[PDB]
Amino acid sequence: MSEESQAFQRQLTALIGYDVTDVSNVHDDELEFTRRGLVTPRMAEVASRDPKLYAMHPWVTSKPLPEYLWKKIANNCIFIVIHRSTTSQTIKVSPDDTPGAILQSFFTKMAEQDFVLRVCGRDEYLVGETPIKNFQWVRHCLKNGEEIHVVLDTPPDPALDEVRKEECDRKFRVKIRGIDIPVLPRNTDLTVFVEANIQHGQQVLCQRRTSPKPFTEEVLWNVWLEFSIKIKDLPKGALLNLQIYCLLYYVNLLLIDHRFLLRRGEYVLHMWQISGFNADKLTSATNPDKENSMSISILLDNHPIARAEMPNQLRKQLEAIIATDPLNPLTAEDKELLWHFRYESLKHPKAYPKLFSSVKWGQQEIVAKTYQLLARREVWDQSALDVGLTMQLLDCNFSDENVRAIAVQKLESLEDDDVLHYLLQLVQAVKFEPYHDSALARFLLKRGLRNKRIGHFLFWFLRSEIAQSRHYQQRFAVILEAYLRGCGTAMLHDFTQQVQVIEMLQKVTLDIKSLSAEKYDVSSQVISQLKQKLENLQNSQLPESFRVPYDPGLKAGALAIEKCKVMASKKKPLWLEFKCADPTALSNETIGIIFKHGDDLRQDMLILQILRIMESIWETESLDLCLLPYGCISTGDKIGMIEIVKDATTIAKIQQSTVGNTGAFKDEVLNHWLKEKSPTEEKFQAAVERFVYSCAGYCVATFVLGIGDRHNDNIMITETGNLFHIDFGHERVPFVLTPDFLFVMGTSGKKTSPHFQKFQDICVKAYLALRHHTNLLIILFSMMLMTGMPQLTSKEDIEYIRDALTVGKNEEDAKKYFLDQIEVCRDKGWTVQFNWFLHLV
Ligand SMILES: CNC(=O)c1ccc2c(c1)OCCc1cc(C(=O)N(C)c3ccc(C(=O)N4CCN(C)CC4)cc3Cl)sc1-2
């Protein structure tokens, strides 16, 4: 291994934020085995991808143009403005024209074909055989009433993407020797025992306990725990879960390894301490902190794997069971039905999750029958892809490799555009895979390496987790490294720039947070030191440019130091502004970015991404709710970026600017603000309309997600009328619809009006459009809770969304339910809003 290659691994380590060659925290070779296992999938995708299309990463969709976007084209014509160093002719185009085609109606229309169309000021290309109406940038421009400005230039050199070459029928038992912790002192000395569980898909096959003993820094049982399950019956993917109760600590050990071998020998496992149900509890990783953590010693001394028509009424029971929601509990009666009627069940793709939860995974013969069942998979294979269904089979309830692979098989058919929609949840779903190398992980690897946009986000989503999750960083690092080894030198250089930038801003963030207290109010002293420090960075270890992490097509240049500052809030986040490093840009507007330290931005990414999913869901229904899921990215431990939405203010600041002593609240302020920021009544009417739509979308989305009761300071609005929520980091009301919002709607004092009627109509339409996707929403909600929050009750917390989506009810009762919800806010008026500030005194 050349000295060059060692320097390279060093490079990857700094981009990843973890050393994948570190062997300090392992008890076997799973991780190394996986690094090697992933080489094949990587080389295969690299060798398979088209260098040209890969370099230009066109962003496209096969989906039809929504009704609400056809509205803006009734002339069957679209205008593209091409530019080239001086003047710019505006070509009239047909929505079906191909980029190379409009290049024919150009060159000849003017009068060598080795040129390509690129969006002005962006690293975005319109290429490939695709109708221009199928390009996302084109649809984004129409939806925003913006013109499509493009520049004619030379295709990027694929050479820049060069990738560096690479080079027994006995019952199961376990001996618990004892436990050891360096320091126990809490308050009162209690007693302690060890609980050993054998689990599969968060289902206990057998449970055993040790006798209680005095809790001292060292407790030695030296006791055999014999389980009812036979060795031969252990399913691959089963975990020996070990727990200490006084519940204090846990740790897991895969009973059958990545080689299909039964675990054997001595183990000293360092455990995880509970913070006083979630994905972290399922991890096969052990606590890396060997100095301050509890450990448990165990011994293993115990390779494997070597007609009749249904009556009308049972079938009805069966179909009823299948119709129930993902969260409906399956009775013992229900499971037996599903299993007995196995072959009938297999004819309904929607039964798959319920059927595989009916499997007795602790019985070799049954599992086998199950694999036999999966053999004739025709009905499933030809079924239309249902993302909600697929994700159900990737959650914590399925530990079987084969069950999860068919889920992954269905994902193979997603277009890149959809992958981007679900990417974050798919990455989080890697936490439910029992092995490091899995079909799900390889699919993400493959898709990321196939498309630059997916690779970029895949990188940040992985790095965010590597940086702040001890439970999963090892697995995610191996995945990221594999990816980094195939993305190409260009991407590598880009990621390097981005990582350098955020690292510098982190330093700065910290140093500046130090030069001030815990809030007040800053301090011209504090702002000046910031500007100096940035001036220092600017010249230079701070790279010429870098891609915006939440908007990779955008290249950020030099900081505009005069415009930077520290925001006035408890935490002291930076308000940074940069110049665009692309001369071809259509404006002088800077790139605003908020850099913040002290908060875990992962919950916000999760919420913002779900918001994006709701928008695409609504698109599948021809609806546009005008949400504004601003860019947000966890870039490392307790740090990240947030997009600064231009021309936007807080609803509270608007209130506050007019008196606002102790937080008095006037109904007409909002309407006045909008009218004053409008240059004309036209623009004002557009603002009001957009407000109605945006208000409706956020009321619905926020109710469903159970995040509806918010303080005014957590909700913003653009000067153009777009309302939107922010800060999703962790009497009552379902959502925020205050009298001022109502005032803009032309209503006041519980009355009606054309815009308000229009609002209720949009809400209801929005609400029921989401109910057609109930299962997708429920499964995303529950995964989000398991992988993104603290230790959430696996029933009651998750059950909220079921109630919220009013599962089980017909359309009439649903509309009713929501309309009453709208009434509650009205009756409550300003109460909850009003309650703030006082709680603090
Ligand atoms: C011209 N644009 C803006 O002023 C602006 C302000 C805030 C945001 C923005 C634009 O983009 C939209 C997304 C966004 C998201 C935010 C967020 O998540 N949090 C937690 C947040 C809330 C308040 C502040 C804050 O201190 N201030 C200073 C007072 N000012 C009136 C509001 C923002 C900072 C953050 Cl990061 S702030 C914010």
Swiss-Prot record:
Cite the record's tissue specificity text: Pancreas, skeletal muscle, liver and heart.
Give start and end of each PI3K-RBD domain: 75-154
Q: What subcellular locations does the record give?
A: Cytoplasm; Cell membrane
Residue span of region Catalytic loop: 706-714
Tell whether Cell membrane is among the UniProt keywords.
yes
Entry's Pfam families?
A: PI3_PI4_kinase (PF00454), PI3K_C2 (PF00792), PI3K_rbd (PF00794), PI3Ka (PF00613), PIK3CG_ABD (PF19710)
Keywords recorded for this protein, A-Z: Angiogenesis, ATP-binding, Cell membrane, Chemotaxis, Cytoplasm, Disease variant, Endocytosis, Immunity, Inflammatory response, Kinase, Lipid metabolism, Membrane, Nucleotide-binding, Phosphoprotein, Serine/threonine-protein kinase, Transferase
Query: Which residues are ATP-binding?
Result: 592-601, 627-635, 724-730
Q: Where is the C2 PI3K-type domain?
A: 168-301
Chain positions with Phosphothreonine modification: 774
PROSITE patterns in UniProt: C2_PI3K, PI3_4_KINASE_1, PI3_4_KINASE_2, PI3_4_KINASE_3, PI3K_ABD, PI3K_RBD, PIK_HELICAL
Kindly give the InterPro entries that the UniProt entry links to this protein: ARM-type_fold, C2_domain_sf, Kinase-like_dom_sf, PI3/4_kinase_cat_dom, PI3/4_kinase_cat_sf, PI3/4_kinase_CS, PI3K-type_C2_dom, PI3K_ABD
What EC number is given for this enzyme?
2.7.1.137, 2.7.1.153, 2.7.1.154, 2.7.11.1
Query: What ranges does the record give for the region G-loop, renumbered to this chain?
Result: 566-572
Protein origin, superkingdom: Eukaryota
What residue stretches are annotated with the PI3K/PI4K catalytic domain?
Answer: 560-830
Could you tell me which PANTHER family the record lists for this protein? PHOSPHATIDYLINOSITOL 4,5-BISPHOSPHATE 3-KINASE CATALYTIC SUBUNIT GAMMA ISOFORM, PHOSPHATIDYLINOSITOL KINASE
Q: Which disease is it linked to?
A: Immunodeficiency 97 with autoinflammation: An autosomal recessive disorder with variable features. Affected individuals have childhood-onset antibody defects, cytopenias, and T lymphocytic pneumonitis and colitis. Some patients may have features of hemophagocytic lymphohistiocytosis.
The family annotation for this protein states:
Belongs to the PI3/PI4-kinase family.
In Swiss-Prot or TrEMBL terms, this protein is called Phosphatidylinositol 4,5-bisphosphate 3-kinase catalytic subunit gamma isoform
- Which source organism? Homo sapiens
Gene name for this UniProt entry? PIK3CG
